[PDB]
Short mmCIF file of C-alpha atoms in Angstrom, two decimals:
data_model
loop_
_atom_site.label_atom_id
_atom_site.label_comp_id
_atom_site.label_asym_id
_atom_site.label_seq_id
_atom_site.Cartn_x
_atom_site.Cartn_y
_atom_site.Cartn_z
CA UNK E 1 151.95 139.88 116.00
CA UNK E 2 153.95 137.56 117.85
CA UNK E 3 152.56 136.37 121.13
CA UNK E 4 152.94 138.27 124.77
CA UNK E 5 155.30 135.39 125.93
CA UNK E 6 157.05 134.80 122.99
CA UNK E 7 158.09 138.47 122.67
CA UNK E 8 159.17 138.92 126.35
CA UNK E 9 161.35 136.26 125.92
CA UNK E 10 163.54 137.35 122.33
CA UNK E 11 164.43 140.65 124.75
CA UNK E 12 165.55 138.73 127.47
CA UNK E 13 167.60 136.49 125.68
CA UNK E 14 169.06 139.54 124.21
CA UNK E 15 169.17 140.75 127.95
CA UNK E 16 166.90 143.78 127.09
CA UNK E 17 164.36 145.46 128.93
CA UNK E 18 160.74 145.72 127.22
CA UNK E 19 159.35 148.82 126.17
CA UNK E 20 155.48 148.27 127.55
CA UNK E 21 153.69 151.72 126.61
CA UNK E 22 149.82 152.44 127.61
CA UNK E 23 147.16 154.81 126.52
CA UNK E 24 143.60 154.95 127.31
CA UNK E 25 141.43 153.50 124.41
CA UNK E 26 138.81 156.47 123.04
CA UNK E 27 141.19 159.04 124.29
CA UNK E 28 140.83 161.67 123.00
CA UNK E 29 138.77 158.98 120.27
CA UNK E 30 139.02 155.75 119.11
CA UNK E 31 140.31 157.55 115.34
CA UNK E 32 142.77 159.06 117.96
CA UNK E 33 143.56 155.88 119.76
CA UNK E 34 144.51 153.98 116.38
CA UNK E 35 146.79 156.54 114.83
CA UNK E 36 148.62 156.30 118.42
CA UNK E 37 148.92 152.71 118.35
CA UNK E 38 150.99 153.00 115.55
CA UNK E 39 152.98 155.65 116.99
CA UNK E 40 153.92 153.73 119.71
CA UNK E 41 154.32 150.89 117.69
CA UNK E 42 156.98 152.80 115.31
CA UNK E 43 158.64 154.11 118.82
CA UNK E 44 159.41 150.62 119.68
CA UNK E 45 156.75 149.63 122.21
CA UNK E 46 157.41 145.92 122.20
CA UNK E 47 153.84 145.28 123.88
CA UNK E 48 151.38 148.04 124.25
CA UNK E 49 148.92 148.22 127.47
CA UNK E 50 145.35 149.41 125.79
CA UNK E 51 142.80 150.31 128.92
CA UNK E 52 139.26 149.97 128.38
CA UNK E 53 137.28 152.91 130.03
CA UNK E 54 134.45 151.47 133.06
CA UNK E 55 132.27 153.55 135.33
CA UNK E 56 134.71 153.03 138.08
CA UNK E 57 138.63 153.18 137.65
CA UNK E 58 139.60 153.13 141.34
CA UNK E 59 143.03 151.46 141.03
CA UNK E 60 143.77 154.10 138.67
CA UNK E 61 145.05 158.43 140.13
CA UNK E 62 143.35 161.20 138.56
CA UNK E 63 145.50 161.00 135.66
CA UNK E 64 143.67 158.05 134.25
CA UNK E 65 140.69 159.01 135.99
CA UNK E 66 140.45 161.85 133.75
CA UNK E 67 141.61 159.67 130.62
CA UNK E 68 138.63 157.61 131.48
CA UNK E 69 135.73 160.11 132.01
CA UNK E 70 136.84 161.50 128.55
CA UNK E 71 136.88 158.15 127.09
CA UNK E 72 133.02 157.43 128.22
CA UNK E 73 131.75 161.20 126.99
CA UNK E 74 133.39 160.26 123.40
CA UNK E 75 131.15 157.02 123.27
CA UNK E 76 133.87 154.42 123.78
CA UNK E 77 132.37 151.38 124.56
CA UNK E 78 134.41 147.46 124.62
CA UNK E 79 132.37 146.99 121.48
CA UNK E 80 133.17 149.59 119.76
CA UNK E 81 137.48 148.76 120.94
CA UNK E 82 137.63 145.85 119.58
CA UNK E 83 135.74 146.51 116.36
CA UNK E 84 139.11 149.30 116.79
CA UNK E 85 141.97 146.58 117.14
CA UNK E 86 140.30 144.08 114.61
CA UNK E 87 141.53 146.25 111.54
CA UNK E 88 144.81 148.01 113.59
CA UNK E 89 146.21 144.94 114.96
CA UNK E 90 146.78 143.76 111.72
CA UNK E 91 149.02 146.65 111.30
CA UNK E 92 150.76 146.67 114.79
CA UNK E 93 154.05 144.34 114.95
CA UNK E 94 153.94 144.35 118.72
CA UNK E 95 150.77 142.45 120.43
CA UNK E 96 148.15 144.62 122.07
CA UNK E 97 147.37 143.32 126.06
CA UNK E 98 144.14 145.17 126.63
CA UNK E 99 143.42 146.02 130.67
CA UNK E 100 140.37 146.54 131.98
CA UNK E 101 138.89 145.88 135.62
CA UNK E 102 136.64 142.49 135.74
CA UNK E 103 133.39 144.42 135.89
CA UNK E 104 133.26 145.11 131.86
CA UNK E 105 134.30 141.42 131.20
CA UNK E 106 133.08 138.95 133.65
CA UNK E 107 129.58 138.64 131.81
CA UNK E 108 131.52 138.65 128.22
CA UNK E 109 132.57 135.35 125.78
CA UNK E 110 136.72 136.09 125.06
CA UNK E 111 135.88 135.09 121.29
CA UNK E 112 135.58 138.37 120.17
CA UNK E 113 138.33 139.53 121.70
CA UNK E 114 140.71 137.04 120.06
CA UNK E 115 139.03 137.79 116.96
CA UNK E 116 140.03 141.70 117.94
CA UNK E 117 143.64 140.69 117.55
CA UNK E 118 144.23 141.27 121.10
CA UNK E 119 147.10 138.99 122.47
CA UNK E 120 147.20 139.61 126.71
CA UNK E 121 144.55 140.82 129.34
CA UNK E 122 145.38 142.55 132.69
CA UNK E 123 142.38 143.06 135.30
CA UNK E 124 143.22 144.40 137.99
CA UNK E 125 140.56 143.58 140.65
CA UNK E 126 140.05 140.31 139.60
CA UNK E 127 137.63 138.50 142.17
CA UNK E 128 139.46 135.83 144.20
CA UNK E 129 136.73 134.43 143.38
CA UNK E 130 136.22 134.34 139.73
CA UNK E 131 140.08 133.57 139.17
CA UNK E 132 140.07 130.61 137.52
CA UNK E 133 137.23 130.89 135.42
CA UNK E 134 138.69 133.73 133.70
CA UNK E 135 141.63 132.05 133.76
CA UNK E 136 140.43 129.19 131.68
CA UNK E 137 138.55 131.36 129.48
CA UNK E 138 141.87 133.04 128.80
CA UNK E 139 144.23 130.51 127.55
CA UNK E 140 140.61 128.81 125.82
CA UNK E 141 140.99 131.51 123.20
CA UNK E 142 144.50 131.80 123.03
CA UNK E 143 144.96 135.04 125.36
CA UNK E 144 147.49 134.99 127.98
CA UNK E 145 146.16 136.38 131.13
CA UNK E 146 148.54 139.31 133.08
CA UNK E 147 148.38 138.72 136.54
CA UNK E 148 149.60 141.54 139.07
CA UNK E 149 151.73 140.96 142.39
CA UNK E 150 152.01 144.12 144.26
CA UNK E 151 154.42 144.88 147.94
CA UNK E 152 151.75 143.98 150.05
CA UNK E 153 151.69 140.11 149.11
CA UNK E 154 153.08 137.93 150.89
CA UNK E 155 155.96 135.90 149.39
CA UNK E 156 154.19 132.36 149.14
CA UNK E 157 151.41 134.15 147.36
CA UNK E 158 153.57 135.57 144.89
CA UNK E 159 154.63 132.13 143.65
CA UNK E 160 150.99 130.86 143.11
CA UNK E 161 150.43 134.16 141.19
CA UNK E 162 153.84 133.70 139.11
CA UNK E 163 152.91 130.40 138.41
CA UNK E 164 149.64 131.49 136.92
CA UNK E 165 150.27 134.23 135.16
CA UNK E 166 151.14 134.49 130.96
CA UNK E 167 152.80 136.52 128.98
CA UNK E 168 154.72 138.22 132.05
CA UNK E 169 154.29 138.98 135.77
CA UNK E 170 153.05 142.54 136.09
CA UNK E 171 154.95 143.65 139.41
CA UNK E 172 153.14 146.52 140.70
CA UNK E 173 155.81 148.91 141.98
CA UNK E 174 153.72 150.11 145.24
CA UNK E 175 150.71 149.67 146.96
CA UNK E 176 148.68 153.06 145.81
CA UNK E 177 147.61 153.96 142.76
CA UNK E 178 148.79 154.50 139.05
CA UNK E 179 150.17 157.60 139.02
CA UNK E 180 153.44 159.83 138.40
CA UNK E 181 156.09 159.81 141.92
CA UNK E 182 158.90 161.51 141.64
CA UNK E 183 161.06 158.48 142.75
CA UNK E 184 160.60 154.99 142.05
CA UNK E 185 159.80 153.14 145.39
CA UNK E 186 163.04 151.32 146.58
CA UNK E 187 161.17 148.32 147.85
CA UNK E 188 161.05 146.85 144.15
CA UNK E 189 165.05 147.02 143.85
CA UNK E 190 164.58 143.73 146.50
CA UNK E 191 161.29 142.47 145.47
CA UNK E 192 162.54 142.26 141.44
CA UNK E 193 164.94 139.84 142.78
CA UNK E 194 162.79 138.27 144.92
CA UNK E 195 160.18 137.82 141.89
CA UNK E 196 162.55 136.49 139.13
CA UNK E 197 164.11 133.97 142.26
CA UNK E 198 161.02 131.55 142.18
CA UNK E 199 159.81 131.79 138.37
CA UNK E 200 161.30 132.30 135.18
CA UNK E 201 158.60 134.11 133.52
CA UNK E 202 159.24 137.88 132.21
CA UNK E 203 158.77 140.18 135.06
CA UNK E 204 157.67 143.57 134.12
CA UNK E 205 157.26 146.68 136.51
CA UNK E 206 154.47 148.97 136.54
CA UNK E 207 152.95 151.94 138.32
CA UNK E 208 155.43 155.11 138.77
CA UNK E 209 157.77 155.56 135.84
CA UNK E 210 157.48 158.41 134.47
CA UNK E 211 161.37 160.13 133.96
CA UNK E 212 164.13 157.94 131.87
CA UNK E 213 166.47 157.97 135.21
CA UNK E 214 163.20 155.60 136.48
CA UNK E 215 163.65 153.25 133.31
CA UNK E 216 167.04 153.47 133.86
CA UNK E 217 167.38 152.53 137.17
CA UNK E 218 164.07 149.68 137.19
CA UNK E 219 166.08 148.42 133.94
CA UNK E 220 169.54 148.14 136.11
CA UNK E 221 167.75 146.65 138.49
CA UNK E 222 166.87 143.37 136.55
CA UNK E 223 163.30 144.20 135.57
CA UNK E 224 162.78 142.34 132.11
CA UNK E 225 160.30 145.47 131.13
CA UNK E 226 158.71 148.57 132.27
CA UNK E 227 155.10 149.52 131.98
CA UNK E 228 154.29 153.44 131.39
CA UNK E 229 150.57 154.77 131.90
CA UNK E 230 149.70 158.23 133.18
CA UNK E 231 153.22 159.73 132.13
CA UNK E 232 151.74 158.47 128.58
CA UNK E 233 148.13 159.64 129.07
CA UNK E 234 149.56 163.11 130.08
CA UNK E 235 151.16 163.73 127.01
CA UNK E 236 148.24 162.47 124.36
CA UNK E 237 145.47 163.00 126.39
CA UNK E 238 145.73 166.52 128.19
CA UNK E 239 146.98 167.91 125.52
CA UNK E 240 145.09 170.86 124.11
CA UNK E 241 144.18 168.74 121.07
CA UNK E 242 144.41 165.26 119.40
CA UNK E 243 147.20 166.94 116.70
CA UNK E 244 149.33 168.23 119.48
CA UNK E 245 148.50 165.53 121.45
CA UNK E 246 150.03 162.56 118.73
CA UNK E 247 152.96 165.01 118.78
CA UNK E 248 153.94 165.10 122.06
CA UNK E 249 153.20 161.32 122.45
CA UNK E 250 155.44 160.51 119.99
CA UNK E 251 158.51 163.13 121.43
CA UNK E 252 157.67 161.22 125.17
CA UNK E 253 157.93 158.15 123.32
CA UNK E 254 160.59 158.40 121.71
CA UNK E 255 162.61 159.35 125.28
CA UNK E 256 161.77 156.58 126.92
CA UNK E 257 162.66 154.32 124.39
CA UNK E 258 166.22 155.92 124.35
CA UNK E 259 166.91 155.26 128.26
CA UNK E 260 166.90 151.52 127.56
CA UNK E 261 169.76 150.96 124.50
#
């Protein structure tokens, strides 16, 4: 697979908007998760967001929540993902940016997950604190770390964060949590702008979408992709069973991929 940054930047020279699908790794199970992958991969998903389940997913609605509780009961552990990507990566033309909040990774070597296949990593609490060192550790083993920006910071902050971040700037669309909204939040018309004004790295949106009218509209907008979790989860996950469950993925897919051409 061709690298986070480097395939971020083909679209935009083509002026396109990414397709940036995610799913919840283990569920319903990894054997589950896999097939997906590739699902999403034949869709079109130019990068796909895998999440790694933790004890506690607070930056994430009861969507993912659910997606996560599931994920633990089945016996997904980051072991056992990555053991997952290592022989499905290989298969995947689109790189795979894992996400998972520091806690599961702070105490971890990123060798194995290079190894993995894995191209990008998004944590979403990241410790002020710990910043840098994951940060180095990142781009040590050739993964480009996915930084977030969200409303609530402050326009001199956002620069420092756009000037860190590889791969892309994940622009969180608001300040609560993943989940579905109706509408997408009309501060990020503005802040897009405002984000792509003071870097020239990819900016992809996040958080929300979940109707084509909302790629639509985020892709008008200027956005140079758009990130898709629980509307994702709801189709594979809660369906009544991992057959259905591909099925529907695929048909959701396949929708969203249509509101960009």
């Amino acid at each position: 697979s061709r690298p986070v940054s480097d395939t971020m930047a083909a679209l935009m020279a083509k002026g396109k908007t990414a397709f940036i699908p995610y799913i919840t790794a283990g569920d319903p199970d990894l054997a589950t998760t896999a097939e997906a992958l590739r699902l999403l991969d034949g869709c079109g998903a130019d990068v796909i967001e895998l999440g790694v389940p933790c004890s506690d997913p607070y930056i994430d609605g009861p969507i993912i929540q659910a997606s996560v509780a599931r994920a633990l009961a089945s016996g997904t552990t980051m072991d056992a993902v990555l053991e997952m990507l290592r022989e499905v990566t290989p298969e995947l033309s689109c790189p795979v940016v894992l996400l998972s909040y520091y806690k599961p990774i702070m105490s971890r070597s990123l060798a194995e997950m290079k190894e993995a296949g894995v191209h990008g990593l998004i944590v979403p609490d990241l410790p002020y604190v710990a910043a840098h060192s994951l940060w180095s550790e990142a781009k040590n083993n050739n993964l480009e770390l996915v930084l977030l920006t969200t409303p609530a910071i402050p326009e001199d902050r956002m620069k420092e964060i756009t000037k860190a971040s590889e791969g892309f700037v994940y622009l969180v669309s608001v300040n609560g949590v993943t989940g579905p909204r109706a509408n997408v939040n009309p501060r990020v018309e503005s802040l897009i702008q405002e984000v792509k004004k003071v870097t020239n790295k990819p900016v992809a949106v996040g958080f929300g979408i979940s109707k084509p009218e909302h790629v639509k509209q985020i892709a008008q907008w200027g956005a140079d992709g758009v990130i898709i979790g629980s509307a994702m989860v709801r189709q594979l996950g809660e369906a009544a069973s991992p057959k259905q469950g591909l099925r529907r993925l695929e048909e959701y897919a396949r929708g969203m991929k249509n509101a960009l051409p």
